[PDB]
Amino acid sequence: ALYEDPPDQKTSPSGKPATLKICSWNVDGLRAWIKKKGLDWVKEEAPDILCLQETKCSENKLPAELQELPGLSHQYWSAPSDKEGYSGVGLLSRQAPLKVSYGIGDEEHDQEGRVIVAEFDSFVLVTAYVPNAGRGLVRLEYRQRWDEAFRKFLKGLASRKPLVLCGDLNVAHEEIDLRNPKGNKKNAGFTPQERQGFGELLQAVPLADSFRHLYPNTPYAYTFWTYMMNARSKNVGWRLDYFLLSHSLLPALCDSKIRSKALGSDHCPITLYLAL
DNA sequence: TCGACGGATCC
DNA sequence: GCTGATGCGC
DNA sequence: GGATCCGTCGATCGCATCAGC
Ligand SMILES: [Mn+2]
Ligand SMILES: [Mn+2]
Numbered sequence: 648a649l650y651e652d653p654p655d656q657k658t659s660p661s662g663k664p665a666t667l668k669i670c671s672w673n674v675d676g677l678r679a680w681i682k683k684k685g686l687d688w689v690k691e692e693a694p695d696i697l698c699l700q701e702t703k704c705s706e707n708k709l710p711a712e713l714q715e716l717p718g719l720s721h722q723y724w725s726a727p728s729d730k731e732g733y734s735g736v737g738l739l740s741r742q743a744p745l746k747v748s749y750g751i752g753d754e755e756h757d758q759e760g761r762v763i764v765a766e767f768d769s770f771v772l773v774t775a776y777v778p779n780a781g782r783g784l785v786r787l788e789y790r791q792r793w794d795e796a797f798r799k800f801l802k803g804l805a806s807r808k809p810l811v812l813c814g815d816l817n818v819a820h821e822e823i824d825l826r827n828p829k830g831n832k833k834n835a836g837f838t839p840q841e842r843q844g845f846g847e848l849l850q851a852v853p854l855a856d857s858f859r860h861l862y863p864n865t866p867y868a869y870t871f872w873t874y875m876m877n878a879r880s881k882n883v884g885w886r887l888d889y890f891l892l893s894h895s896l897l898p899a900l901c902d903s904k905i906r907s908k909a910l911g912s913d914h915c916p917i918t919l920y921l922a923l
Numbered sequence: 924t925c926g927a928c929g930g931a932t933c934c
Numbered sequence: 935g936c937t938g939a940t941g942c943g944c
Numbered sequence: 945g946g947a948t949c950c951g952t953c954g955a956t957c958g959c960a961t962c963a964g965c
Contacts, residue, residue, distance in 0.1 A: 675943090676959045701943090703960060732960040733942075779943060817944080825944090827924075836944050873944055874957040876924045883924070885944060913944085913958075 649882045650867040656902040659922035665901040666923050670694035671774060671813040671888060672909075672916035673871070677702040677735070681710050683911040692906070692918065693718060695741045698763075698774035700815045702726075702735035713739075725749045725760040734759045736776050736814070742767075751800040756793055764804070769923050770896065771804055775814040780835035787840060790817075794844035802852045805893050811921075812854060812891040815871075815914065820845045820856065823866050824886040836885060854891040857903035857919060868905055871914045879913075890919040899923055 657665040670692055674680035677699065689697060697719055705726050713722065719739035726735045738747070744765040750757030765772045777797070780787045804810055818841040822828035831837040848854060862868065869884030878884060890903050901920035909916050 679959055701959095703942095731962095782943070819944090830924080831944080834944070871944065873924065874959095875944095876956065878924065878944095881924095887944075 648867050650869070650905075650907060652868070652905045652907055653862075655904060655918075655920065657920055659901050660898055663899075663922040665920040667696075667919075667921040668692075668694045669696045669698065669772070669811065669813065669890070669919040669921070670906075670916050671698040671700070671890070671919075673700040673776070673815040673888060673912060673914035675701050675703075675912040675914060677704040677737075678708070678710060680911045681712055685909075685911040686712055686716070688906075688909045688911065688916070690716075690718070692909075692916070694918065696765075696772065697739045698772075698813055699737045699739075700735075700774070700776035702737055703732045704735060705731060723747050723763055723765070725763055727760045728758050730759065734761055734776060736761060736763055736774055738763045738765055738772070738774055740765065744772075751797060753796045753800070756796050766808065770809040770811055770893075771807075773801065773804070773810065773812045773814075775812065775816065777815060777817040779817050780838060780841060782835065784833070784835060784838065787835075787838060791840055791844065794841075794848070798844070798848050798851055801848070801854070805852050805854070809893040809896050810852070810854070810891075811893075811896065811919070813889065813917070813919065815887050816845065816889050816891075817887055818842060818845045819885045819887060820859070823864075825869065826867070826883040826885070836887065849891070852891075853894060855894055855897060857890040857892050857900055858886075858905070858917075860897070860900070861903055869907075870905060870917060874913050888914055888917045890917065896921065 724737040746766040819825040870888035872879035872884035904918040
């Protein structure tokens with residue numbers, strides 16, 4: 648069945664108003680997404696921080712519209728080191744971060760422009776585009792290696808500051824997180840190995856699934872739909888895009904949204920409200 | 924994701 | 935710039 | 945031996961590249 652995201656809750660569990668609004672979006676081709684009016688949607692949402700995944704766009708080719716964007720003037724981009732039109736992430740912020748870094752510190756895993764770490768006053772933001780296990784599961788062996796290194800990196804990071812992790816984590820954690828769980832247990836994104844990695848990420852860092860924490864029993868809430876077979880119009884999709892939080896920030900959590908109606912990609916954007 | 928193939932296996 | 939083919943992806 | 949089931953196994957959509965010129 649179709650899904651309607653509930654209204655934005657903008658106070659914390661103690662009624663402190665939301666001070667920080669982060670939006671994350673796998674744009675699936677940055678240039679195409681801008682031509683499909685993505686930035687119009689971003690300007691109306693007016694986030695304080697905007698994280699993009701799968702930009703498929705070198706730093707030379709970044710369209711001009713992105714400079715004329717003064718609510719998000721501090722902009723950071725990572726592209727693969729030797730693979731054009733593939734992967735890529737960016738982070739755009741209203742306020743400059745204290746410190747920005749690329750990758751996780753493991754050469755093996757830092758060649759495909761997938762991770763930006765931005766340290767602010769009260770917390771660290773990681774945005775990530777996790778490697779897809781691939782058709783026929785060709786990259787499943789590599790993904791489990793990625794998962795373990797990524798988990799260890801985030802565990803280290805969260806021991807020093809509160810952590811927000813957002814982005815396309817390329818796994819649907821539980822059967823409620825996709826429309827066709829039965830038909831997809833040997834497919835990328837829903838293998839038992841990918842579901843276990845997510846579980847161990849939640850437990851080992853530790854982190855909480857912001858959206859599932861607030862709506863633990865809400866089905867049909869998805870962030871991705873394949874372009875094929877008109878899946879989006881039937882809401883035959885997957886929840887692949889997350890905000891994961893240090894438990895300490897759970898009392899700062901106001902809401903975790905899914906903007907199902909914003910068009911322009913095969914993912915919709917997700918939006919996080921925090922009281923900091 | 925879907926339909927079309929199989930090759931089972933029951934009524 | 936243009937065609938046609940390939941890589942990638944839930 | 946005619947009908948439903950049940951595991952593969954191809955053809956879709958969309959973006960961006962590449963090879964050639
Ligand atoms: Mn994509
Ligand atoms: Mn079946």
